[PDB]
Amino acid sequence: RPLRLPDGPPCSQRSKFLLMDALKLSIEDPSHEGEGIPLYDAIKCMRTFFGWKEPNVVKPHEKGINPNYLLSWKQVLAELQDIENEEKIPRTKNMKKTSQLKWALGEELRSLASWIQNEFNKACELTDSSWIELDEIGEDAAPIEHIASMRRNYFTAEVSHCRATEYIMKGVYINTALLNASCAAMDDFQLIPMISKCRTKEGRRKTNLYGFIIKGRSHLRNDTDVVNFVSMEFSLTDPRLEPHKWEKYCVLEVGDMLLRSAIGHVSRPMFLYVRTNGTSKIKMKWGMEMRRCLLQSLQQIESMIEAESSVKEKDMTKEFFENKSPKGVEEGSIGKVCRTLLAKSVFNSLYASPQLEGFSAESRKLLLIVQALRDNLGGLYEAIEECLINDPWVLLNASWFNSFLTH
Ligand SMILES: Clc1ccc(-c2cn[nH]c2)s1
């Protein structure tokens, strides 16, 4: 019996920041006065783009006050325009407590949609930039063994350029900046750039601006206290193609960007995805630990190599990673196995939820029972299917589980 997935309107994006739809304004090998101060980097990234235009709503938020989102973006541009006149650019920028920001900061079954599988496919892909250093992975006090080192070097070469690794580092930066601001500027509506850093194929260091968040008041006495925030994120994705994906956003058109393409230079609109959101201390601490996704999925790989080494009474690291008993790789390559394991780990983090917890545990129990039944030939379903409500990541993993059943 396959799991019964819920009927209803398509599910919508619920991640803390854009994934496949993000857009970056970037600067190469930066060397301005104050390189490495987020606000300074953001302004320089902002100053590389000249296609800004009078913004307007193109996909209104059905349940929100759309003029306040518009006003909120215009305030960001205006207050950055002010900073450009203050001869000493401040280290941080606290927004005026305008009515639009006071509103935005707080003073149902859903069916599976195709976009979540597309997000996952996108997370498995390679990018043309590296997002981590060679020795990023691991925490060991002592120097590591030769074998462990070999395994780490092989794995890193496969995932350093991976999109899921960008999501890790993007998530790590934004959660660190937000948690630090929640502490250092409790009463301020601080402007917090969304930044990442990477190294191009040619070795050039590069700094990336995805957009901005503004945080609300944050007197976070405990781990579950919530700080509100507004996110404002660049994108080339036209929201009118998949509006169900964007139920929680107000989307603006804010510029036009000139692009290289397969058909030569082309001009495409630049959008700004705006929503209100919230997070807590404990979620921000987990966001800061997303590099553990790299360690956890390496350990799944090492688990596999250690099994092959136990059978062949010999270390199989080179044989495993160079693909040289197994006669192929189901995902196509060892590299794609690494990136797929990583993407599952990262999405478990980006889409963490009680629904995911229940589905994970309960579907595992049903798995083993189905395996043992195969190899040798209700109730648990209620536990599994009770978790299938509206979360895109859970619904996709259920769709995946159902394929595992037909085969
Ligand atoms: Cl930094 C900034 C770069 C561009 C800005 C702008 C755009 N429209 N009005 C002001 S502020």
25 lines ligand 1 (CB under 6 A): no
Cα–ligand 1 centroid distance for 240 (angstroms): 26
Residue 119 φ then ψ, to 5°: -60, -45
Report the distance separating Cα 281 and Cα 83, nearest Å. 30
Report the distance separating Cα 366 and Cα 384, nearest Å. 9
Cα–ligand 1 centroid distance for 278 (angstroms): 27
**Can you read off the two tokens belonging to residue 13?**
């994006």
The angle formed by the CA atoms of residues 55, 57 and 63, to the nearest 5 degrees, is: 140
28: which strand partners?
Answer: 206
Residue 96 φ then ψ, to 5°: -60, 140
Atom of ligand 1 nearest to the CA of 43: 1
81 lines ligand 1 (CB under 6 A): yes
52 lines ligand 1 (CB under 6 A): yes
**Can you read off the two tokens belonging to residue 354?**
């009680």
Report the distance separating Cα 246 and Cα 274, nearest Å. 10
53 lines ligand 1 (CB under 6 A): no
For 187-264, list the strands marked E by DSSP: 189-200, 205-215, 226-235, 250-259
Cα–ligand 1 centroid distance for 211 (angstroms): 13
95: which strand partners?
Answer: 189
78 lines ligand 1 (CB under 6 A): no
Experimental technique, in short, is X-ray
End-to-end Cα separation, the chain, in angstroms: 12
CB 170, CB 210: distance < 8 Å: yes
Report the distance separating Cα 366 and Cα 17, nearest Å. 33
4 lines ligand 1 (CB under 6 A): no
43 lines ligand 1 (CB under 6 A): yes
